[PDB]
Amino acid sequence: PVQKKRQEQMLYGVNIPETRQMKFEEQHPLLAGALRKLEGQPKGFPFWYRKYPTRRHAYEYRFSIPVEMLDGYNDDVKKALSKGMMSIQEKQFAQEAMYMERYAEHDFDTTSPAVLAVKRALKCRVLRNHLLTNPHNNIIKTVLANTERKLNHALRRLRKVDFKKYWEIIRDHDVQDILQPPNLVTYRQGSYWKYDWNAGLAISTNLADVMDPR
Amino acid sequence: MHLAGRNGRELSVRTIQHLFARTDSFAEALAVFYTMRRCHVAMNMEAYYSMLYSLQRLEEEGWGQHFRNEYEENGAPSEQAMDFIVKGISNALLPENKPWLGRVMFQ
Amino acid sequence: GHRLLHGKREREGSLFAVANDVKRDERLLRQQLNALLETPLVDLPGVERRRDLPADPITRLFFQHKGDHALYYGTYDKPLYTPIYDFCHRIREATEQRKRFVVVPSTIETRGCARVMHDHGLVAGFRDFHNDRAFAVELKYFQGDSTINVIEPCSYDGRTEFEWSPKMMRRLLNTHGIHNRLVVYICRTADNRIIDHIHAVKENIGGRGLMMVH
Amino acid sequence: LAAAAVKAAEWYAAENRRKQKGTAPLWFDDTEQNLLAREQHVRSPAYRELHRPALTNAAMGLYGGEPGFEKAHRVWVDPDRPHIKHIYNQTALARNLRYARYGYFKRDMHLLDVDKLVRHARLLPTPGRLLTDFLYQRVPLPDKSCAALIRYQRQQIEMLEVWGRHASFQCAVEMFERMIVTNIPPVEVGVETHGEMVLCAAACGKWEEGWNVYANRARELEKESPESFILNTFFFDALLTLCVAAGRVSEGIDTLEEVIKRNLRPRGTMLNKAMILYSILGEQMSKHEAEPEEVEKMGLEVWSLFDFYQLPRTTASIEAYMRMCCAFNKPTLVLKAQGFADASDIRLSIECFHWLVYAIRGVAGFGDYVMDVLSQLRPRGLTPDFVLFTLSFMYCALQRDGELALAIFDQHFVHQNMNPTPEMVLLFIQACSNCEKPTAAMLERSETLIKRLEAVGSSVDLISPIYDQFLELCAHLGAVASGFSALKRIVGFGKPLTTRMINSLLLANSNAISSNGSLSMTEELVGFFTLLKIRPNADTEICVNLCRDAFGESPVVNDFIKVIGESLQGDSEKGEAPQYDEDIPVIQVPPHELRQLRTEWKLSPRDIVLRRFGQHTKPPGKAALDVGSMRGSVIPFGRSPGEQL
Amino acid sequence: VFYSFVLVMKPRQRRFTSQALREIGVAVYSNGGLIRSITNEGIMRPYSRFRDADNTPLTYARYIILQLDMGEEEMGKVDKIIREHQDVLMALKLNNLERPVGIRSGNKELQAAYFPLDTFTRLEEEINWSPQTSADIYTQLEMNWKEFSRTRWSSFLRN
Amino acid sequence: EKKRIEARQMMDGRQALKKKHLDLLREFHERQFFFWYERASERLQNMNLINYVPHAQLREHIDKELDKYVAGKNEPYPLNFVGQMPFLEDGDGNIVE
Amino acid sequence: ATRWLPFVSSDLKDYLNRYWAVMFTVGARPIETGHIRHYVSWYCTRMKVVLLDHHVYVEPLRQQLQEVSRTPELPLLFVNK
Amino acid sequence: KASHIRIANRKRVEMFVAKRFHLPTRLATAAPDIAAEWHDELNPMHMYPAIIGIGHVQPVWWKCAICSHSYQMSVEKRVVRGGGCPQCVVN
Amino acid sequence: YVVGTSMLKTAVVATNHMVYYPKFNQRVSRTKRFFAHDEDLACVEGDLVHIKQCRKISKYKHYYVFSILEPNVEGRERLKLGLKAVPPPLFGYPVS
Amino acid sequence: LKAGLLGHYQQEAFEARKRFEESTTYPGPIRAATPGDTRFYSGSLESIL
RNA sequence: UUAUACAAUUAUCAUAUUAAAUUGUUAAGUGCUGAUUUAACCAAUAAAAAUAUAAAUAAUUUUUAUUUGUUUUUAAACACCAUA
Ligand SMILES: [Zn+2]
């Protein structure tokens, strides 16, 4: 279910099967199917579809609706579909989409390490913000701890796989000591750097590009 | 085309292929495409891909005609003539050096 | 610029079609995409390049050469507790339940050890043996009783591993003061080829212990 | 403002001379008494005795057989200036992170320092609930403690999202109500509490709720009891921060005027904020025109005020000065600012470099200066951003040099291997098009950038302008086949063709006499005009004439040109005769306004490490097999392999 | 976000009721939102008598149904306005409009198998059906029905 | 050396196969997007019927809607959302009948 | 492995295929249901009683019962379909 | 699990903080004399002396009992600081 | 791995070795800390260094940095920024 | 350090060295410098003489 | 020679049993949802580094349960006493 939810967020028609009725229609036709069969202005083929391969290429409107789809409707409908009416979940997805646009190397790319670190940290901020208002949420405390650890792992891999992106992400957002040894008692023993060796990241900087290794 | 757009009649891939077959020139096919875009006519992604392939072939034939025209004056093909023979038309939405793409659409 | 691939998934090449899950299977999706990517190919096992073909003519007869359709072959999936431990446990449980086929993971060691069991005559056969995720073992019975009496890993716990020496292999061959071809001990040599103690002692070598069976 | 500073300084000196009659600093420093009080508290005997180091074993006793003296006595540390290396630890028996919880400091609340509590307590309840606890146990809450509570609520407000901040601000308002109306424990709401409330208002916006309500209340209460309610410099700092956040310029300038007129010393933060207000006013004027000269003087005046009041200036001040200078169009002055920052010891910022490059966008030359800035980013610890590349390409486009843009690309951007923005691609191709001597390498770079941008997607949709400039470059280079190639890309994106675009294609044909020149292709381009339903142009007439000259005569071309002339003559007779192909403008936007792909994304590594929010990681459930714990011989297959039941 | 409200208001004078609803609508509009529709629902007698702010039980109450589009923050602002209003004895807020009830809790497979736009686009009367509304009315609307209903009152008409 | 070279070449071939399969998936997502366009486009058509109440028309609509069940009327009164005819009020919200 | 859900079906055949011994009754015939329950419980056989008064699909199930038993008699017992 | 009480049957608040702060500090409760002047004509309907309570910094309309003048002032200024009618203090 | 550089011309390198327990057939990895010598101050915390023993340079310094196998790029950039090579930890040893 | 990763790191180093030998392609004839001397002889200390 | 801990009546202690769950003040719902009823609106929360051989690849925090404090014109009550 998690993967189904996020796949639906990413892709447009991933729900709709070839039979043109997703699962909810089969059991509740009276809700999903359009009640009124209207003969108005049945629109033609979208010749602009090349612009939006995924939902994160159009996040300035509700339900990831491209502006070319809103050409003929009324200003009230456009305002209802504007950002201001956007829900909190879709606002968070738009925040994710900004960074996907910034750091994705190809369309349909949603797992590259630079993107993953940013998404884990966005989730961490979301959970921490929730805890600010509602500190008595133990499940959210546990999820926040797990998300922080995974964010640390993602940033540590990013640092040695693509350093420039890591440096840029750290600088842009005024969080410099995010990669930080917890305990001196164990940092004294190289246990903070042995992480790179155990993770396979110890030989991954291409010295000639940062300094002449002679 | 406006009649079709208002009636919401969806053009079949076969109809679009036959329509663009009857064209002779790249500009004529382009004008037909832009008429279809100006009117709000419906079709399938399959028909769209066939239309773009038709435009692609029209451009290739036009450039081939130009290079043939030049060939008689020059007595021998040019380096651009042979390089066009090998490369083909430049970037297109359905290249032939990538024959794997188009199978999901075409049936 | 040049970005390096870190994990086995990136190195082997992976679409990561699903939204964020990096560890999603992908084997099926890649298999059907490759299948529709084509019919000069038969359903016999494929090999990616010619020189990989078997040496035995009869096995070459069953094997076919396919460029990139030799990958993602297989029907079954993979069903702590290292693969040899889990292989022994599943085979023991199925034998005690008097079943016919046991779907068991296919790793280098597990697959070689199953082949050695076949050679010594403890398994009637296999199904989907060329799968690189899991293969089925066709167990053999004789007069209501199962051929395999006991099968257990060298690492009785799931943790501790061992290294058998040639003296250990001779020890096993002459275990308990007998000449011991009855119970078969399997060892993976330094050449990553799995042999039984008879051949190990004949060749004056040892290896990492896998299991014992009889 | 410097005039007001001089008047206030001389008046303060005169007052000091009158007092001496009844080094004579020229101003008053509101921070000095608090700093001195802190230092005296640190030096107090009680503080030293309480924070005395831990007792040595030789000071406790011998060999630790005595129940009372076997180990040292509990040592109390001060989180602000700890007398020990690390305040916390996670050894098995001396864990102390759990004892930073608020519940343990609840035992001692009549003595408590609420700001230090808010800063260094871990499982701290919601600020409203904390205030309820304080009032419930009835501690004589003073103004500093009320300000600490409002500061806690303000921190929560800042951490919140922009679109979820009203409710937290309303909680702050309710707490202020409670403090003002409660008396059963003495609760004092003072100038710093009003400042914190104004600062919450500024953080959430709400100019009307901050200025009109709480600043007015502070002024009224000061006028009621001036001796018991003094508007200090922090209050004006918060007020002027509210002004900056709301965009109000006159109010912030008048607030700094009040601070100067009062004989108290302003602080570098509000000085930078006033500089930012002047920069905003200068940009507003430049927009209006597109008396500023006295605004420029009054703006540089606070920069001189930095030296007047002996305030050290920081990176924020440098950035504000550069922004103001660039708003007033003084590239030499911003360069002076960079040199000053380097001579002094203060780090530059990527934003400082943004302003440094954006200031020279207009002045000619400086081509190698941009290259030097890009090259010297690396030794200074910084790395270029897409915004910085956009500004450099903006300079390249405005100065219409293609070689500099090509060098920038080749020598820095390919190595950066960051995604190109549509603005970046537009500016690059636009510079390469307006360049006087475009070269074929620019075709490769532009088409590669376009393909890379298409490979990653975007949400700004400058497809038609980027392809327009690409066709213009193909025109200036004679690449008609490349123009036809890009024609299919425009078709595939489904955007209308343009008269300018076909004019550029026709000019490409004219300049391509050697590189695939074809009169039949001229006829094709004429058919584009005839069939696509687009008005021809006077530049279309120019280009058809040049193509006619380049290749020869043709009946279709002659008919086309005659109809073009007839149509434009008829349209001139009707009216509105002159119509040429308008240029695509060079987007010239400040670095703080051009779209930036980043949000607040605010987190605190200290809170992550110290688990301020009670973050809990479930243990791995007996997953620590250690050799000192194992008891039993281990052999292959186990002690008794294969046992039957 | 598509929000819907059901207001139970004490039946005061028409001018007072109009003033209350005008203030509510002005809050909606000054908070950057749109009202999809407003419907006076008549004066009815609820089964349980709500006490006025004067702690007097009111036997009768007028019902008003509002449908509007607002962001979450300003929706909360106007929601508190409505709740703390003088006249509003109760205000029932529909959160179930974009997503039909039961799928968040019902079945995991089906949680991501619905189209939010389907319910977002249609009005509340088309998501929650009254006793009188039934698909026959929608079929009648889809039919022209002008030349079909013309013969309805003949058999009874002549007798 | 030979073994390591083969490993590197295999990795590169895997990258190329990933390229081809990504290009293949792009088509599937393009077709799936098409289904969304049809379904999404139709759902928006029906949204045109939503008759919002402009702020200018707000007071007029409020009064005309409050005048719905008053009294002394020719056309039949409508049933409320619960399908129960409510009481009538002469005017100014006073119940009479 | 899955949440508990009471079984309902509009088809008498689903009940027959699912439950070994199934009795359909009503609340207006308590004594007959008590007697059949007494017998079945005495012989210690799992039995499912279904009240048709509030059961949805009441009319379908009732007509199906009437046509299979050739009589309107709500208290009815079924074993092995 | 926190228990709430609705003040004047409209505003739901936590019972603890309500009994401690909200209930005793409501305008119609603490200062009924000041509540009398509450301008019920020019002052929004969702605000009335039974809810707003003392300490309200936002200005509200007040109808004077002496000169019948309508003036705008904050509730905290009116009740705590001792605000008054400008026309009356002029007279 | 270079672990500390608070001393001038000296790098503290954390090195590991293996102890063998026959009874449990275990191979447990221990750790040892060495004062290395880098005369030109070229080692930053987080560098994977190759260290070689030699004559004695100081009371506890009989090793030297033969080569830096993998420098700390992030540490060098932070030092360029003027920060600490690695942010200091917040936990440590108890005082009692 | 875990020795099991030595093979993977060997493969990565081989590939990195090949990429280096293939991409930059900027060797050349460079004058060699005299190797100077080293202070880190092994064994115990030596005297001044 | 146990290289083994059957077994329970000093045990020798001690990862919180999770989408069927927990939390909601600024967010939902309710008189404390569990009297009825195996089913409970909305918001948050289900996956997402390398590596299975790799011999530390984990964290050092949390509390939904019960008592007790906090105080407590201060619960109205009800029940216990006669506070809670
Ligand atoms: Zn008065």
Stated as kind and residue range, the H or E segment containing C104 is strand C101-105
Structure tokens at E148: 């079909």
List the one residue out of B100, D444, C25 whose CA is nearest residue F19. Answer: B100
Bridge partners of C47? Answer: C65
DSSP 8-state class, residue C175: G
Candidate from D417, D625, D638 with C-beta closest to C1: D417
The answer to whether D77 touches D83, Cβ cutoff 8 Å, is: yes
Residue appearing with tokens 């007071």: F59
Whether residues C36 and B100 touch (CB distance < 8 A) is answered with: no
End-to-end CA distance of chain G: 28
The answer to whether D319 touches D303, Cβ cutoff 8 Å, is: no
Rounded to 5 degrees, what angle do the CA atoms I39, I45, I48 make? 85
Alpha helices in chain H (DSSP H): 15-17, 27-30, 32-36, 75-79, 86-90
Task: Categorise residue D273: left if φ over 0, alpha if ψ from -120 to 50, beta otherwise.
Answer: alpha
Alpha-carbon distance of D391 to D354, in angstroms, equals: 7
At residue D48, φ and ψ (nearest 5 deg) are -60, -45
* Dihedral sign, Cα of residue I86, residue I87, residue I92, residue J1: negative
Alpha-carbon distance of E11 to E59, in angstroms, equals: 10
Alpha-carbon distance of C122 to C116, in angstroms, equals: 9
Q: Is the CB of C109 under 7 A from strand K?
A: yes
The answer to whether C176 touches C170, Cβ cutoff 8 Å, is: no
* Dihedral sign, Cα of residue A12, residue A16, residue A17, residue A18: negative
Q: Is the CB of A154 under 7 A from strand K?
A: yes
Distances (CA, A) of E23 to D125, D190, E19, E54: 37, 36, 6, 22
Query: Which residues, including other chains, have CB under 8 Å from residue B61's CB and lie 6 or more apart?
Result: none
Whether residues C164 and D642 touch (CB distance < 8 A) is answered with: no
Burial class (CB in 10 A: 0-12, 13-18, 19+), D97: middle
Give the HSE-up count for residue B64: Cα atoms under 13 Å, Cβ half-sphere.
Answer: 13
Residue appearing with tokens 């293609």: D402
DSSP 8-state class, residue D162: G
Alpha-carbon distance of A157 to I65, in angstroms, equals: 27
Query: Which residues, including other chains, have CB under 8 Å from residue E104's CB and lie 6 or more apart?
Result: E111
Q: After which residues is chain J broken (C to N over 2.5 A)?
A: none
End-to-end CA distance of chain E: 54
Length of chain J: 49
Contacts with F31 from chain B: Cβ below 8 Å: 45, 104-105
Query: Which residues, including other chains, have CB under 8 Å from residue D606's CB and lie 6 or more apart?
Result: A177, D612, I90
DSSP 8-state class, residue H18: I
Q: How many CB atoms lie within 10 A of CB A39?
A: 9
Q: Is the CB of E116 under 7 A from strand K?
A: no
For residue B21, give the 3-state DSSP assignment: helix
Buried b (16+ CB within 10 A) or exposed e, I56-79: ebeeebbbbbeebebbbbbbbbbe
Q: Provide Rg for chain H, Cα atoms.
A: 14
Structure tokens at J32: 């060699």
Residue appearing with tokens 């059907």: C32
Q: What is the DSSP string of A158-178?
A: HHHHSHHHHHHHHHHTT--TT
Own/partner pairs, H66-70, CB within 8 angstroms, 24+ separation: H67/H91, H70/H39, H70/H42
Structure tokens at D183: 């008396």
Residue appearing with tokens 């130009």: B66
Q: How many CB atoms lie within 10 A of CB C117?
A: 23
Q: How far, in whole angstroms, is CA E158 from its chain's centroid?
A: 41
For residue C155, give the 3-state DSSP assignment: coil
Q: Which nucleotide is nearest to D643 (CA to C1')?
A: K4
Residues 75-94 of D with CB under 7 A from strand K: 90, 92
Q: Is the CB of A127 under 7 A from strand K?
A: yes
Residue appearing with tokens 């921060």: D241
For the CA of F12 and the C1' of K15, the distance in angstroms is: 46
Query: Which residues, including other chains, have CB under 8 Å from residue A121's CB and lie 6 or more apart?
Result: A151, A155, D601, D603
Residues 73-92 of C with CB under 7 A from strand K: 80, 82-84
Alpha-carbon distance of D220 to D201, in angstroms, equals: 19
Distances (CA, A) of D546 to D465, D528, D543, D550, I35: 25, 18, 5, 6, 79
Q: After which residues is chain F broken (C to N over 2.5 A)?
A: none
Structure tokens at D290: 């597109």
What letter represents residue D285's amino acid?
A: M
End-to-end CA distance of chain I: 30
Whether residues F34 and B105 touch (CB distance < 8 A) is answered with: no
Q: Is the CB of E93 under 7 A from strand K?
A: yes
In chain E, whose CA is at the least distance from the CA of D170?
Answer: E77
Q: At what angle do helices D143-159 and A113-133 cross, to 10 degrees?
A: 140
Bridge partners of H73? Answer: H60
Own/partner pairs, A85-88, CB within 8 angstroms, 24+ separation: A85/E1, A85/E33, A85/E69, A85/E70, A85/E71, A86/A62, A86/E1, A86/E71, A87/A62, A87/E1, A87/E72, A87/E98, A88/D163, A88/D164, A88/E72
- The answer, for C156 touching chain A at a CB cutoff of 8 Å, is no
List the one residue out of C154, C173, C162 whose CA is nearest residue C208. Answer: C162
Structure tokens at D172: 């702050």
Burial class (CB in 10 A: 0-12, 13-18, 19+), B8: middle
Distances (CA, A) of I93 to A184, D93, D95, I30, J32: 8, 12, 10, 20, 51
Structure tokens at D150: 């409002």
DSSP 8-state class, residue E15: H
Alpha-carbon distance of A29 to D17, in angstroms, equals: 91
Structure tokens at D205: 């916006």
List the one residue out of C137, C139, C157 whose CA is nearest residue C147. Answer: C139
Q: At what angle do helices B45-74 and D480-493 cross, to 10 degrees?
A: 170
- The answer, for B66 touching chain D at a CB cutoff of 8 Å, is yes
Alpha-carbon distance of D123 to A138, in angstroms, equals: 12
Task: Categorise residue E100: left if φ over 0, alpha if ψ from -120 to 50, beta otherwise.
Answer: beta
Q: Is the CB of C107 under 7 A from strand K?
A: yes
Structure tokens at A186: 């164990």
Burial class (CB in 10 A: 0-12, 13-18, 19+), C213: buried
Alpha-carbon distance of C174 to H42, in angstroms, equals: 107
Alpha-carbon distance of B3 to B80, in angstroms, equals: 45
Bridge partners of E9? Answer: E62, E88
Q: How far, in whole angstroms, is CA A98 from its chain's centroid?
A: 8
Query: Which residues, including other chains, have CB under 8 Å from residue C12's CB and lie 6 or more apart?
Result: F11, F14
Q: How far, in whole angstroms, is CA A202 from its chain's centroid?
A: 28
For the CA of A137 and the C1' of K45, the distance in angstroms is: 10
Query: Which residues, including other chains, have CB under 8 Å from residue G28's CB and lie 6 or more apart?
Result: G53, G74
Query: Which residues, including other chains, have CB under 8 Å from residue I4's CB and lie 6 or more apart?
Result: A188, I11, I12, I45
Residue appearing with tokens 């297959």: D637
The answer to whether E51 touches E57, Cβ cutoff 8 Å, is: yes
Q: What is the DSSP string of chain A?
A: -HHHHHHHHH-SSSS--TTS--HHHHH-HHHHS-SS---S------TTGGG-SSGGG--SSGGG--GGGGSSS-HHHHHHTSSTT--HHHHHHHHHHHHHHHH-SSTT----HHHHHHHHHHHHHHHHHHHHH----HHHHHHHHHHHHHHHHHHHHHHHHSHHHHHHHHHHTT--TTS--SBHHHHTTTTTTHHHHHHT-TT-S-GGGTS---
Contacts with D633 from chain I: Cβ below 8 Å: 23-24
Query: Which residues, including other chains, have CB under 8 Å from residue D487's CB and lie 6 or more apart?
Result: B30, D505
Is chain B touching chain J, with at least 3 CB–CB pairs below 8 Å? no
Number of H helices, E strands in chain E: 6, 6
The answer to whether D202 touches D242, Cβ cutoff 8 Å, is: yes
Stated as kind and residue range, the H or E segment containing D115 is helix D114-120
Contacts with H48 from chain E: Cβ below 8 Å: 53, 86
Q: How many CB atoms lie within 10 A of CB D475?
A: 25
Pairing mode, strands G47-51 and C194-196: unpaired
The answer to whether D429 touches D449, Cβ cutoff 8 Å, is: yes
Residue nearest to nucleotide K73 (CA to C1'): H24
Q: How far, in whole angstroms, is CA H72 from its chain's centroid?
A: 13
At residue F54, φ and ψ (nearest 5 deg) are -60, 150
Q: Is the CB of H9 under 7 A from strand K?
A: no
In chain E, whose CA is at the least distance from the CA of F50?
Answer: E36
Structure tokens at E130: 């009254």
Alpha-carbon distance of E84 to H44, in angstroms, equals: 11
List the one residue out of G7, I46, D422 whose CA is nearest residue A187. Answer: I46
Query: Which residues, including other chains, have CB under 8 Å from residue I94's CB and lie 6 or more apart?
Result: D89, D91, D94, D96
The answer to whether A15 touches E115, Cβ cutoff 8 Å, is: yes
The answer to whether D478 touches D514, Cβ cutoff 8 Å, is: yes
Distances (CA, A) of D282 to B74, C98, D325, D391, D398: 65, 88, 9, 20, 22
The answer to whether E35 touches F53, Cβ cutoff 8 Å, is: yes
Stated as kind and residue range, the H or E segment containing G23 is strand G21-25
Alpha helices in chain B (DSSP H): 2-7, 13-21, 26-38, 45-74, 79-87
Distances (CA, A) of B66 to B28, B58, B63, B77, C171: 17, 12, 5, 12, 85
Distance from residue C138's CA to the centre of ligand 1 (Å): 103
For residue D544, give the 3-state DSSP assignment: helix
Whether residues D531 and B27 touch (CB distance < 8 A) is answered with: yes
Alpha-carbon distance of B71 to B94, in angstroms, equals: 28
DSSP 8-state class, residue G5: -
Contacts with B103 from chain C: Cβ below 8 Å: 36-37
Distance from residue F76's CA to the centre of ligand 1 (Å): 54
Q: How far, in whole angstroms, is CA A66 from its chain's centroid?
A: 19
Stated as kind and residue range, the H or E segment containing D369 is helix D367-377
Alpha helices in C74-165 (DSSP H): 83-96, 108-120
